[PDB]
Design an enzyme around this catalytic site. Structure first.
Site, PDB file in Angstrom:
ATOM      1  N   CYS A  38     114.429   6.909  60.430  1.00 60.11           N
ATOM      2  CA  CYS A  38     115.625   6.699  61.436  1.00 60.11           C
ATOM      3  C   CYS A  38     115.226   7.469  62.663  1.00 60.11           C
ATOM      4  CB  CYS A  38     116.871   7.281  60.676  1.00 60.11           C
ATOM      5  SG  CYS A  38     116.668   9.103  60.321  1.00 60.11           S
ATOM      6  N   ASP A  40     116.073  10.773  63.206  1.00 55.04           N
ATOM      7  CA  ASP A  40     117.065  11.905  63.382  1.00 55.04           C
ATOM      8  C   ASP A  40     116.251  13.241  63.225  1.00 55.04           C
ATOM      9  OD1 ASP A  40     119.321  10.224  63.854  1.00 55.04           O
ATOM     10  OD2 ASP A  40     119.370   9.988  61.680  1.00 55.04           O
ATOM     11  N   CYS A  63     122.299  12.131  59.196  1.00 58.70           N
ATOM     12  CA  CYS A  63     123.684  11.313  58.540  1.00 58.70           C
ATOM     13  C   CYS A  63     124.148  12.408  57.454  1.00 58.70           C
ATOM     14  CB  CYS A  63     122.799  10.078  57.563  1.00 58.70           C
ATOM     15  SG  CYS A  63     121.588  10.979  56.426  1.00 58.70           S
ATOM     16  N   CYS A 107     116.068  12.244  54.110  1.00 57.84           N
ATOM     17  CA  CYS A 107     117.197  13.053  54.797  1.00 57.84           C
ATOM     18  C   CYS A 107     117.301  14.434  54.273  1.00 57.84           C
ATOM     19  CB  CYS A 107     118.389  12.160  54.898  1.00 57.84           C
ATOM     20  SG  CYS A 107     118.213  10.428  55.288  1.00 57.84           S
TER      21      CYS A 107
HETATM   22  S1  FES Z   1     119.876   8.552  58.394  1.00 58.20           S
HETATM   23 FE1  FES Z   1     118.902   9.865  59.731  1.00 58.20          FE
HETATM   24  S2  FES Z   1     118.444  11.906  58.629  1.00 58.20           S
HETATM   25 FE2  FES Z   1     119.576  10.524  57.253  1.00 58.20          FE
HETATM   26  S1  FES Z   2     121.423   6.310  60.507  1.00 57.08           S
HETATM   27 FE1  FES Z   2     123.068   5.401  61.661  1.00 57.08          FE
HETATM   28  S2  FES Z   2     124.419   4.590  60.215  1.00 57.08           S
HETATM   29 FE2  FES Z   2     122.714   5.031  59.105  1.00 57.08          FE
END
Ligand code: FES
Ligand code: FES
Ligand SMILES: [Fe+2]
Ligand SMILES: [Fe+2]
Ligand SMILES: [Fe+2]
Lengths: 127, 132
Positions: A38, A40, A63, A107
Site C-alpha cells: 500500500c 504506508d 490501516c 501491515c
Molecule cells: S493498508 Fe497500509 S499499512 Fe495496512
Molecule cells: S489502504 Fe486505504 S482503505 Fe485500505
C-alpha cells in the site's frame, strides 16, 4: 460464509485505543519502514534508559491492522532489554491477530520492523 | 524532490479527530463497499428524516486517507437532502486530498461510494414499502 476473516475484539480495542501513539523529540532510536503493497509508512521512536526501552512511540498513516499491531508491539517492548526487543516479531502476538484478513500480515510486520530499525539506529549512534 | 506526494493538514486533522465514526443500529440506509487493492471495507449508516440525512455514521478498518475522507464526506452529507447527498463525491474535498500518494485515490473514493450505496438501499426500501 466459509473461511471468515475479520476484526476480533482485541484488535478492535487496539485500533480504537492504541498505546504509545506519538513522537519523541531527539530520540535515542528512530526507525521508519514502509509497506511494499500500500506504501504506508510506520515510524518508531525509542528512548533507552539503562539498556532498556524506557519510552517508545509510534506514528503511522496506515490501516487499522497496522495501528493495532503497533499498539501491541510497542506495549510489549516497553521495559524490555534491547536484546529482548530485537527478538520481538509479529509472532509474539499471533493469537491476537488470528482471523485478520491475511493480507494484513504486511501491515502487522510494520511494527516490529520499525522497532528493529530504531534499535539498530540506536546501536549505531552508540558506536 | 520530483513527483512529490504527501499529506495535508486538513487530512491530518480528519485522521486524528474523525467525525461520525461508529454504527447506527437499525439504519434507514446501509452501504458497504470495498477497496479492491488492500481489501479494506467501508460502511456507511444513515438515518433519514424529512427526506434528509438526519444522522450518519461510518466504520472502517482502512488507512488514514480513507478515514479522513470519510470524516469529511459524512460531515458534508449531514443535513443534506438525498438528492444533494447522491451528488457528493471526493471532488467536494479535492483540495484536502491533492498530492496524496496516487494509491490513495481508491481509499478516498470509499466514503462517497458507501454513502451512495446507503442512499440507494434506503430508496429501494422506500420503493418496496420496507423502510420504517
Ligand atoms: S493498508 Fe497500509 S499499512 Fe495496512
Ligand atoms: S489502504 Fe486505504 S482503505 Fe485500505
Ligand atoms: Fe509484505
Ligand atoms: Fe482503485
Ligand atoms: Fe475505489
Amino acid at each position: 460464509m466459509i473461511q471468515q476473516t475479520g476484526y476480533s475484539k482485541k484488535v478492535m480495542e487496539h485500533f480504537m485505543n492504541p498505546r504509545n501513539v506519538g513522537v519523541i523529540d531527539d530520540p535515542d532510536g528512530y526507525g521508519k519502514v514502509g509497506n511494499p503493497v500500500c506504501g504506508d509508512l510506520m515510524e518508531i521512536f525509542i528512548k533507552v534508559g539503562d539498556e532498556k526501552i524506557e519510552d517508545i512511540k509510534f506514528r503511522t498513516f496506515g490501516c487499522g491492522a497496522a495501528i493495532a499491531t503497533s499498539s501491541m508491539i510497542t506495549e510489549m517492548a516497553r521495559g524490555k532489554s534491547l536484546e529482548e526487543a530485537m527478538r520481538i516479531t509479529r509472532n509474539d502476538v499471533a493469537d491476537a491477530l488470528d482471523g485478520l484478513p491475511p493480507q494484513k500480515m504486511c501491515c502487522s510486520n510494520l511494527a516490529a520492523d520499525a522497532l528493529h530499525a530504531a534499535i539498530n539506529d540506536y546501536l549505531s549512534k552508540k558506536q
